[PDB]
Enzyme design. Structure first.
Site, PDB file in Angstrom:
ATOM      1  N   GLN B 192       0.853  -1.181   0.000  1.00 25.62           N
ATOM      2  CA  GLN B 192       0.000   0.000   0.000  1.00 25.62           C
ATOM      3  C   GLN B 192       0.892   1.235   0.000  1.00 25.62           C
ATOM      4  O   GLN B 192       1.743   1.388   0.882  1.00 25.62           O
ATOM      5  CB  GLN B 192      -0.941   0.002   1.206  1.00 25.62           C
ATOM      6  CG  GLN B 192      -1.989  -1.105   1.193  1.00 25.62           C
ATOM      7  CD  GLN B 192      -3.079  -0.883   0.158  1.00 25.62           C
ATOM      8  OE1 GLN B 192      -2.823  -0.888  -1.047  1.00 25.62           O
ATOM      9  NE2 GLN B 192      -4.307  -0.686   0.626  1.00 25.62           N
ATOM     10  N   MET B 193       0.694   2.110  -0.989  1.00 24.55           N
ATOM     11  CA  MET B 193       1.605   3.236  -1.185  1.00 24.55           C
ATOM     12  C   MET B 193       1.661   4.150   0.034  1.00 24.55           C
ATOM     13  O   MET B 193       2.685   4.801   0.274  1.00 24.55           O
ATOM     14  CB  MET B 193       1.199   4.027  -2.428  1.00 24.55           C
ATOM     15  CG  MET B 193       2.204   5.091  -2.842  1.00 24.55           C
ATOM     16  SD  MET B 193       1.678   6.044  -4.281  1.00 24.55           S
ATOM     17  CE  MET B 193       1.762   4.803  -5.568  1.00 24.55           C
ATOM     18  N   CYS B 194       0.584   4.209   0.818  1.00 23.24           N
ATOM     19  CA  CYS B 194       0.556   5.044   2.013  1.00 23.24           C
ATOM     20  C   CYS B 194       1.169   4.371   3.238  1.00 23.24           C
ATOM     21  O   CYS B 194       1.114   4.948   4.328  1.00 23.24           O
ATOM     22  CB  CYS B 194      -0.883   5.461   2.328  1.00 23.24           C
ATOM     23  SG  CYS B 194      -1.377   7.051   1.619  1.00 23.24           S
ATOM     24  N   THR B 195       1.750   3.183   3.096  1.00 23.73           N
ATOM     25  CA  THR B 195       2.284   2.450   4.237  1.00 23.73           C
ATOM     26  C   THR B 195       3.717   2.881   4.525  1.00 23.73           C
ATOM     27  O   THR B 195       4.571   2.859   3.634  1.00 23.73           O
ATOM     28  CB  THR B 195       2.240   0.941   3.987  1.00 23.73           C
ATOM     29  OG1 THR B 195       0.880   0.517   3.818  1.00 23.73           O
ATOM     30  CG2 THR B 195       2.862   0.190   5.156  1.00 23.73           C
TER      31      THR B 195
ATOM     32  N   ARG C  17      -0.663   6.373  12.210  1.00 21.49           N
ATOM     33  CA  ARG C  17      -1.493   5.691  11.228  1.00 21.49           C
ATOM     34  C   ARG C  17      -1.599   4.192  11.463  1.00 21.49           C
ATOM     35  O   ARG C  17      -2.543   3.571  10.961  1.00 21.49           O
ATOM     36  CB  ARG C  17      -0.964   5.949   9.809  1.00 21.49           C
ATOM     37  CG  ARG C  17      -1.661   7.096   9.088  1.00 21.49           C
ATOM     38  CD  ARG C  17      -0.702   7.965   8.276  1.00 21.49           C
ATOM     39  NE  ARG C  17      -0.051   7.243   7.186  1.00 21.49           N
ATOM     40  CZ  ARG C  17       0.358   7.814   6.057  1.00 21.49           C
ATOM     41  NH1 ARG C  17       0.166   9.112   5.860  1.00 21.49           N
ATOM     42  NH2 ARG C  17       0.946   7.088   5.117  1.00 21.49           N
TER      43      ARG C  17
END
Ligand SMILES: Nc1ncnc2c1ncn2[C@@H]1O[C@H](COP(=O)(O)OP(=O)(O)OP(=O)(O)O)[C@@H](O)[C@H]1O
Ligand SMILES: Nc1ncnc2c1ncn2[C@@H]1O[C@H](COP(=O)(O)OP(=O)(O)OP(=O)(O)O)[C@@H](O)[C@H]1O
Ligand SMILES: [Mg+2]
Ligand SMILES: [Mg+2]
Ligand SMILES: [Zn+2]
Ligand SMILES: [Zn+2]
Lengths: 99, 302, 304, 106
Positions: B192-195, C17
């Protein structure tokens, strides 16, 4: 259970009727094991296509009830239902599975 | 640098083929944390020709994670910088960097003319190399390279990271499954690119990906799936939270949107016209692969 | 501002996050001593700065060889001939200029050797102990077990956490030393309990596992479990390249270990360098002190 | 086997004597597995110190049969860890006759 409800002559009959009407399909029957506490689904008999995988079949059951062992053997997710059918089909012609 | 490898052969593994590793032309798709650590493991193994492919520039946060870049490099294009960095380590390297955007599936074309040229250059780069490492940070950037490398019959080694896990797998050839087989055969932070990942994950995935390549390059012992370097697993899944590694093998899936025979044949007949439609409308891909029919049969049974 | 913020922002994103209870500050403020600036020290230091560790001190007595850069990730071809520890520190600062990166040219005295300069190796012993005392975590990244003994003893005496990384041809061992407080074993417990060039990937695996063990170890332990917010805190990690495997192991401290035996601890506490200089030149004196001598002579009387 | 040769009255008598002449030692009977094919041991009764480890007891057996480098030890159908002390195993897997019975196999 399914086998308790219908005798062999009726089981082998509809199975051989499924082969002529829906040959691309595979007659599979599922029911939760007595130890499992998961919901038991609305349906038990399914005419799954031959190219369907076990992992895809897990999705259909989890949708019908919010691990799938077969004869003390959990097959790989990548296994096709038609492949499991050639090896595990009952004398009547259905594929019995549990979860 | 060759002496350390030379001792490894006759003092330890006489049957080890070093020349096949040295002369392997390696293409690295991605010059991020994976590409940097993979290239370092490759030159330690004696690989002479390495080509970086990347369309990015060095960000302020990259150097501590991407072991080819320094603070003073921020803002510079990655691919050419990474190649020059290898030559700083080993001046005899045949290292080059190519600034190229891999067209990503699931997006309208921004500039068909330029993206058609990028598609052509991508295919020519895959064709002129022997091993392709897919080291991007997103599933959508993996599709076109996976297809082209299968069309060109090149070995692909995929590495993908999650927050505390990694996946290393090689693609089958026209057979074993590809990266896209699993997700459609078995319908979260991984790739996942946001990881943002735990720093050690990229290091582990990189070394295992290169060790898998070097073993895969060796001859098989008959009646077994082993070489002089050991196993050649299809897939390697490592987890940091419980310090485990799991190996897995999956067959090629008939309706895979990447390696299905119908996808191969659609590309073989229509080329860029098929690719363009697949990039902008991935459902059209599932129609060609047959996944659409399977998806609507899962629907009916549900 | 963007200097420090870039690395730390990346880690804050990770925390908020994915793992809100992750303690980033305990990691950032951990003072790390790296004993050895070779292949392991270079990769360990890179993983550490990516985790935001601000203070890293290299200890090494070597110089960059012509074949080092291709395996030792902080050195370039132009660095041949330069002392390693100061160069490794300077190389870290080129990556992240706000580093408190320091290199100390220092020879760890090796057990099993006659002293070549008593005054100088005494001074080296004092410097080693001072460095260990001022840091929080000590990474033992030297290739020889004769170089591991003195740092293991000093770190135990100074109540510091030790993380050992050791490489075989296709295997690696990562382990944390037990401390004095049900005590865990040290690097030297096994070979007396069980008497009887590497593939490039080994050092990359061992280094990253060692750092990820440290970061997990620094988190608070859940009650009733030996786990943290980052997962397990195993005593030992053993990995193998030939079958792509990894095993977790745990070992108790051995009463007759020549490194962490209570008698060895007591003799060092009493004599310090006077005891160390004798152990360095006569390792058999160590096994007498630890009680291993009686065990070995007993293994004879049982086997003859 | 050892228990076949001697009856319990004789076994528990010698074992209670060993506790007198050697208070800090554990009486160990070691015999080869009746199935495995390792060289049969020449000596079977061992008076090992209490603080001896399993791995050290493995070492003395390997040299007692001159076995070049694999050896496995068994106690009551389990493989004890190498770091275990013979006193701890003797405390748990002891036989009523006072002997610790161990088995070795390839
Ligand atoms: N479609 C694409 N074409 C070409 N290069 C790509 C494409 N997608 C990603 N990349 C490159 O692949 C690399 C992915 O690696 P990585 O995620 O480690 O780097 P990053 O995204 O710059 O760093 P971070 O994730 O820490 O912000 C990046 O360098 C990026 O520039
Ligand atoms: N007694 C000691 N005191 C200080 N530093 C030491 C001591 N023993 C070893 N070292 C350092 O520890 C490091 C170990 O690194 P590593 O084994 O990865 O590479 P190397 O031994 O320098 O070279 P090669 O890769 O050829 O073995 C070396 O840089 C060495 O200088
Ligand atoms: Mg990224
Ligand atoms: Mg060395
Ligand atoms: Zn596929
Ligand atoms: Zn010890």
């Amino acid at each position: 259970t399914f086998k308790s409800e219908y005798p062999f002559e009726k089981r082998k009959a509809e199975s051989e009727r499924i082969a002529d009407r829906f040959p691309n399909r595979i007659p599979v029957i599922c029911e939760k094991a007595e130890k499992s506490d998961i919901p038991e689904i609305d349906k038990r008999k399914y005419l799954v296509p031959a190219d369907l995988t076990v992992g895809q079949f897990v999705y259909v059951i989890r949708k019908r009830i919010m691990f799938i062992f077969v004869n003390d053997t959990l097959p790989p997710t990548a296994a096709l239902m038609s492949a499991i059918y050639q090896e595990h089909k009952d004398k009547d012609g259905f594929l019995y599975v549990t979860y | 640098v060759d002496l350390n490898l030379k001792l490894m052969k006759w003092r330890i593994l006489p049957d080890l083929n070093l020349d096949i590793i040295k002369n392997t032309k390696v293409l690295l798709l991605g010059a991020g944390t994976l590409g940097c650590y993979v290239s370092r493991a490759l030159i330690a193994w004696g690989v002479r020709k390495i080509t970086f492919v990347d369309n990015g520039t060095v960000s302020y946060s990259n150097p501590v994670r991407q072991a080819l870049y320094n603070f003073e490099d921020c803002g510079k294009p990655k691919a050419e910088l990474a190649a020059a960095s290898l030559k700083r380590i080993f001046p005899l390297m045949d290292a080059t960097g190519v600034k190229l955007s891999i067209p990503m599936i699931g997006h309208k074309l921004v500039n068909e003319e330029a993206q058609h040229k990028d598609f052509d250059r991508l295919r020519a780069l895959i064709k002129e190399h022997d091993i392709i490492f897919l080291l991007v940070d997103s599933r959508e950037s993996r599709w076109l390279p996976s297809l082209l490398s299968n069309i060109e019959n090149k070995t692909v080694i995929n590495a993908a990271l999650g927050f505390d896990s990694y996946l290393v797998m090689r693609h089958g050839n026209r057979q074993l499954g590809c990266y896209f087989c699993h997700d459609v055969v078995a319908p979260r932070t991984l790739d996942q690119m946001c990881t943002v990942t735990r720093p050690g994950v990229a290091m582990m995935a990189s070394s295992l990906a290169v060790e898998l390549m070097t073993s895969l390059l060796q001859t098989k012992y008959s009646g077994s799936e082993t070489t002089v370097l050991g196993d050649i697993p299809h897939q390697i899944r490592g987890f940091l939270h419980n310090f485990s590694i799991l190996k897995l093998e999956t067959p090629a899936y008939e309706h895979c949107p990447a390696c299905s025979p119908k996808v191969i044949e659609a590309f073989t007949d229509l080329g860029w016209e098929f690719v363009k439609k697949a990039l902008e409308h991935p459902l059209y891909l599932e129609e060609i692969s047959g996944l659409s029919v399977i998806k609507q049969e899962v629907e009916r049974l549900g």
